[model samples]
Target: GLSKEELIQNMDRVDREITMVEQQISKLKKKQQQLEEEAAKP
Candidate 1:
């Protein structure tokens, strides 16, 4: 239910969505490293 102009005004469109996606991916990798580190602790 979004008009093209509505999208054009409200969001970063496509190119910047890449950065938000990268942030989430980095968050996942960070969690993986944290969990492995925690598991190795006494």
Candidate 2:
């Protein structure tokens, strides 16, 4: 029942949310890799 303009705006907001979360995941992944490398070292 939503209008096309409203739907497009909603999609744009969703895109921003996904981009933020993806960046957070990348940061966590990099930290995990660093920790694993440190653990592996004597």
Candidate 3:
């Protein structure tokens, strides 16, 4: 069982991980879009 402070700390860690994952996804999407555009061109 976690104390209040521990619970808050755990939640903060999870939030940070989520933010990092979101940034990675955004970067990958941009790269994929660029590749796709190149493929469509001659």
Candidate 4:
């Protein structure tokens, strides 16, 4: 049915966006951790 296909398509789009956001978050967390370590150094 049209509704089913629409739902599947929307879910796929959301999944891709979520993946991209997760990747960006991982990179940001790594950068933040590095910065924190640097700041802690004497």
Best by TM-score: 2
- Candidate 2 — worst ten consecutive residues by lDDT sum? 1-10
Q: Give the whole-model CA lDDT for all candidates, comma-separated.
A: 0.86, 0.92, 0.93, 0.91
lDDT of 2 by residue, 1-42 (tens): 488798889889989999999999999999999999999999
Write one digit per residue (lDDT tens) for candidate 1, span 1-42.
588888886565676889999999999998999899999999
How good is model 2 by TM-score?
A: 0.80
Question: Which residue pairs overlap in candidate 4's backbone?
Answer: none
Show how many residue pairs clash in every candidate, following the order shown. Answer: 0, 0, 0, 0
After TM-score superposition, what is the CA distance of residue 18 in candidate 4 from its true location, in Å?
0.7
Superposed model 1: Cα runs more than 4 Å off: 1-12
- Estimate the lDDT of model 2: 0.92
Judging by lDDT, tell me the better candidate of 1 and 2.
2
Best-to-worst ranking by TM-score = 2, 3, 4, 1
For candidate 3, the 10 contiguous residues with the lowest summed lDDT are: 1-10
